[PDB]
């Protein structure tokens with residue numbers, strides 16, 4: 001029997017959107033969809049004789065849309081794409097003693113990050129929240145993107161605007177003053193549709209980044225103006241928050257503090273990368289505190305985080 005996935009290998013899809021992997025087989029039967037992510041492989045579903053049995057974790061998430069209406073079409077559909085769903089998907093068709101397989105890499109692009117232009121909380125109406133997202137090399141995040149970010153581990157007890165004019169915030173362990181509409185249950189708390197002129201923070205979605213982000217330093221660091229002038233001296237400019245988080249997502253160790261474009265300094269952190277300046281290999285991390293952001297005096301001395 002023959003199996004084919006007619007799609008170029010680096011299949012790129014956005015965060016929170018859907019995914020369709022075409023898989024067609026010829027049998028001169030049982031279908032299995034699995035996914036290898038780094039070192040872990042997860043069986044997504046197994047179909048046979050018209051019935052599909054789906055992984056419990058991927059319930060209402062993966063499906064075979066054209067099966068069994070077209071019994072020779074093992075096309076897979078994956079909904080609500082979190083950045084975890086990246087990896088190499090395997091479509092394997094087996095009959096009796098024969099079996100064939102095909103693979104396809106999926107790269108879920110984009111990252112959802114918080115923005116608050118100054119240390120003052122909740123200062124952006126809907127329009128100016130969108131403007132802040134635009135000025136930080138991003139768009140205003142859709143609620144699906146924020147849901148995927150929460151499913152990936154994002155948590156911040158700060159209400160922020162979204163694309164659908166709603167104001168939400170994700171939380172895994174409910175805290176005092178952070179329960180919202182989910183009681184003491186985890187989830188993405190929402191305030192519903194709000195008036196276009198209510199002030200909150202913003203949740204932005206940074207999709208892609210064509211240039212590169214790097215640290216420009218000096219023996220005495222830089223004041224903010226010196227950092228901007230150092231970036232401009234190298235034919236570059238101070239990286240925005242979206243560019244910073246896109247570089248940090250791509251694997252660049254941006255944990256060290258440095259001047260960003262908006263006179264702010266962020267310390268990106270996660271459960272996988274909780275340390276800075278090194279790593280503690282004999283220790284695993286379960287919980288990690290929310291991302292920290294300082295709005296230092298313009299005279300403070302840091303590295304420059306330039307983008308080119």
Ligand SMILES: *[C@@H]1O[C@H](CO)[C@@H](O)[C@H](O)[C@H]1NC(C)=O
Nearest residue numbers: 112113153154155289290291
């Ligand atoms: C920090 O922000 C990044 C990007 O917004 C996110 O992926 C990460 O989960 C955040 N960390 C925490 C602990 O919320």
Ligand SMILES: *[C@@H]1O[C@H](CO)[C@@H](O)[C@H](O)[C@H]1NC(C)=O
Nearest residue numbers: 037040042057084151152153
């Ligand atoms: C990613 O997905 C795998 C398989 O579903 C799961 O075991 C793992 O905990 C997830 N990790 C993150 C960081 O989302």
Ligand SMILES: *[C@@H]1O[C@H](CO)[C@@H](O)[C@H](O)[C@H]1NC(C)=O
Nearest residue numbers: 125126194195196197198199
């Ligand atoms: C916002 O707009 C509404 C209706 O357009 C108006 O009544 C209200 O005064 C405005 N400001 C605030 C803070 O709600």
